[PDB]
């Protein structure tokens, strides 16, 4: 079978055999040899307006599908344009491969065109960042890097490979073209230890108010084993931004409008593929004052951070959840606490959803962003099925409203733990190309949207059927609010009444502007029918979000949010005794 | 005088006392304490749509004015959005300070909001990248970093400082607030050694065809000492993209249409504040086959790279040029070679300029980009003075045409050695705010423009009177050309017939589209009268630039350009003798 | 229960509660606050002559006992003196903690005493390297770092923590002193997936010549599940330098003197906690021309390097071995290939061992190093049980002789994949302190010994009952031999006839010089009886070692060894010319 082929040809074959049917990127001569070979093999090339956007598209693809995705960018500014999107994928622990161009070996350190230390810049935010200088070993390096992206020898996240242009053009002998490096590999499935499963089952039997909080790792499962454990355990259930859609909304455990009540009173916190980072108050006793802790994950990045488990299970989370459910066969949980939370949640969530359809305009006479979520809700079952829809959110206040306003989605993506503004359009494109028969709706602040707005062109040229709804409040409004509240002086946080519909139409998309909230349902209906489309909603600056009211803009010393920080300050003063003296 | 003040207040005072009258950035809570204190001191805040753009604006400010400029960006994605612009400033050796936000010390390594290893990511492309954790020493650190940006303990370029939000809020005692750290410092002026000056004078006296090539370091002078040395030496003169405007166009040495002829035949190459990087063929004997080498600079980054000088002068370049001119008092140079180049240059450059006014449309029936440079030339002395105009160029083919088409500018900026697409709009903004009574004209490819187009909003909101002229050829055209030529398959390099005038109007700027080259002068006149303005020129894909024809897209093994690479391959085969054997 | 205590006190308590009963180090003011608190808690301080030797001692302790060991060293040169020993532990994937001193936060970047970028220097060779600037979070950082040393979020290896002296003096409130961070944690035990177990059992049933090669991860087990799989599978068995002692020498699978024959013919290579690095020919098809590959390990650092498995099991290796053994309950392996290798191994190994007793002196009239191994063999079952002895080897030719000359040992340590000369004495000290009732015998080249010789003092002052036997050949001899062979010019590889016995005596150890090989048994008997003790053996420069003439000094393009490299050159020629 095998004959001598150039490195660039073997790279393209590696990718295709690993299940890569599309590559996101932006062409330059340093990667053209691979670009050409991917084209020749029938791999779709999704070319973008800013390399960072290509990496965001890969991120969305992998997060949605489970298939490791690929971005390809040229030397120098091509690679440096990806740093934010790489960092975002690193924080979220998403497997992806970035292939960068780089100058030929002979010109090393001589000031060749577009030279910059790519591997040194990317090393801190990647699982691997390497320059491949041996033609014979390029295939082996690709396969190992792909494994490291899944989390081998680290934790899941992005990897970076570059091949000097002279090496790309070298031949690889047939003997070195080994099938074991070319072939797709299954995910690892480490299994739980029976004694850890029994120990967790014993903690659940002893707990009165157990609570499961899911993350990334749980979201790699279909949710069915998590529901088996919820049923067997009687635990309350919370998800996070990275783990929406695993548990039906009507499930007796699902209490997503009772987040603070669950954290305050749970006596057994079980994390499932979830970090106890700022989004869960660092798992601090100040935020979980009654909780024993158990941690379940396929990576210690979701076992050891900030709190240790009385039990920690390192295993494929589905298998762990199934085994604990099995161990609770003859347990009859006390669900009084869960059922009381659920009764109040059902009413609070229903009332909140219904109020989205009629929210008053703010004091400036413009639309409250809640009306966008109400109009989507009104259209559900009519012109779209939200239960089949990929929902994306981005921005400041808009994003915080979206976490309450978006309840019925198939899948949800957003700015993530990194707070990465500008993901909305690139994520919408990756999602739409992965799921061409699903509605894809991105709701975004105007600040965030300006970062990646020109990717509306990409959506039109590649026919990604996205709908982008802009909360056009002429501001970085959550920042304007923190300025007013904590300094009395608003400066450098105002934007303008930009025609984002006109920007979309300039790039060949359907555009409409809305000033009257009664026009929103019709404008979003027209956008869904004419995707790719943008709806530019003139929204109020008088709309405090849950995040603006909790001090997210101020950056307290110990926690992201003022109320959590207050509890932390109190915790640090406990029981110091006569040892204490005033800082003077 | 002095009392306890918070770190953030002392930072703002440091900046203002160091001559900072504006800061470019994008607000977040992590830098709000400094942002507020700059506002309170009357420092102008130029807030942008993408943090990378703020660093490009600082770069343009410093390159134009000589005053070290400042960008301020928030933690996480705020800092990671600057990497390309930082890299660009590092390659070009431009002093600038980036102030980044970062999370409070107590949350170190805990997964706080927007955490990422900023200093590790930026260390390879900065002169210093530090986290300031001692309130008492913040002022001292700022002043040392500012010195390192000028090139102390390194070479000129960007520096990065971040202050954890808890440290920003700490008080500094009055004793630690030292005037020697707060005060503006003069540039260093190391002086030449008389013996090196005499040695260079002797080499000039012995040379028949001496040639000066200027760079960055020469461009920090007003050009008058360089002209004294040209007059005294009889040398031919070439500039580079980073050193335009130092020598009158009519000067007997100025032979900018004879670049290859000068490099081929010079017997004495004198670099003045210039790197022998890819833009000058690595100073290779393959490109300068007859040249002895002399190097003059205030930094060894422009003395030791790729070629060593028979003499090297490390000194303030003005002083070096003046001293060598003095040493040649009674020398009568042989200028036959110079004067013969000049006679042919005068005619070639005049004919080329005049032909810009009537260039034929390409085979697709659209405008040749040369017509943009002709229309600017036609308007010169009428509605603008090109000799007072800051010209900016960006893109691929468009940029290569611009290097021949732009001859009469006050100052010129472009994509630089790094090939940093998307600098046009941000640079135009920084230039326009530095020089509010000067025309600022940016000519850009459509590919490059999509990266930073949304900064047209910034130009409108801050009233930066820029004119952006887009070469709208519906392509990354220099890439499309290299694909066709070297692979036969054009893929992923096509864009669309986007309404860039409509994008500008969406953001409140004056916009006009041009399809007929006879309308260009009127459209550019209207743009200059209504700045900020954009002219969207529908240009041809049938237009090979000097760069497309020399293989810049292909990346040869040894040089950026095919003809130079050919010469290099020939050089490597010289005189190997019987030792040689076929690679088989 | 808890009250406010200084950081330094909470660090000492963390270590003791994690099972640390000893800390290896060298005092400086930057670490004195911790040093003092360890002393007060009764944690033994083993103070050394060079910080690198403290980290070698920690490495040996962890590798032998399974308990993560700790070195503590001061700012600046105290930390930079550890880099070789840290790199060695990183290469061998040994958990250990290095606690470094560093200057106070207010003097950051001001040129304080002993300042240097410790965390930047150590980042590339550690699983974590951090400066701890929040007193409240030091205990949490220690516990996370300890987990990472075990391999969480990485792979097993050394970690580095430093606390600025101002932070060491800060108080930690009682609420932040969480028991979950202070307490010792069990090792993780990920379990095999039954489908992978069945797939490996199917490959074993279909193989005619299966072979298991063990490494570090197998050596973390007691070997009983490995023997169960050997018995169930009929596989041949090879160990490596890092995995000796798991399988009795008399076991029908143990064919250590047939390494080449095993690699050449096996049709199923099974790696057990082992890397396919240079020591196994990169697992190359050039070196294993008939082998399908299966990989078993609790870390992907021993699954994905160079060769992929048709099946890869990421699990605690004992559990994986046990499950595959179970799956083969009704399998009757064809062991003819195994039994043929074993018959030739038995004869070859026996003849080799017996010849050690009578190896003639070299052409220069001096002892052949094999006589050292013959004398140890003669003493076995008489003066000591080598099967209860911790054997350590170091050097060039001496080490190569040692790999074949040392066949019985409770445990074996050496220079490792990193080729880290000078480990013998510090390893012997860590081993002797960990196993005070076991004989500890370190055989070293004279070149290697010069690096760490002054740690004989440490052995004497801490009563570490070690025996050091020096192959004193007045040379870096494996290097002198490569120069003679390949350049015809020996330069800068000669040493002198140094009195290493006299060095030992100067540091208060027992010393004896041996020039007559018939005196070796007696001298080694006297050394064992008077440990700590050194035997300085005047050995020949004129003796080829098993490693001689194999291109080790040449450093071929593709493989460590010429014959392997030749096979790689031939592999790259296969099918070239054949395009059409
Ligand atoms: C790369 C290697 C692991 C490869 O060595 P191997 O071929 O695995 O050899 P060894 O295990 O040492 O054994 C070599 C041969 O001896 C045979 N052998 C082994 N034991 C015996 C006994 N008891 N009797 C007879 N023969 C024996 C074995 O079957 C091999 O022959 P065959 O069956 O014919 O193969 C090693 O060479 C090595 O580690 N050296 C590199 C240098 C180094 O790491 N040291 C640091 C200091 S020098 C660095 O600067
Ligand atoms: C620190 C160090 N320096 C150099 C080497 C290279 N090296 C490998 S073996 C060897 C010679 C060892 O000499 P010795 O310990 O006397 O053993 P001999 O070969 O003489 O038996 C050398 C220098 C090394 N591995 N480590
Ligand atoms: Mg960017
Ligand atoms: Mg907004
Ligand atoms: Mg173009
Ligand atoms: Mg020796």
Author numbering:
A (entry chain B), B (entry chain B): 15 to 598
C (entry chain A): 15 to 594
Authors' description from the paper:
Actinobacterial 2-hydroxyacyl-CoA lyase reversibly catalyzes the thiamine diphosphate-dependent cleavage of 2-hydroxyisobutyryl-CoA to formyl-CoA and acetone. pmc2-Hydroxyacyl-CoA lyase (HACL) enzymes belong to the thiamine diphosphate (ThDP)-dependent decarboxylase superfamily and catalyze the reversible cleavage of 2-hydroxyacyl-CoA thioesters to the corresponding carbonyl compound and formyl-CoA. AcHACL is the first published HACL crystal structure and forms a compact tetrameric assembly such as the OXC and ALS proteins. Interestingly, a unique feature of the actinobacterial 2-hydroxyacyl-CoA lyase is a large C-terminal lid domain that, together with active site residues L127 and I492, restricts substrate size to ≤C5 2-hydroxyacyl residues.
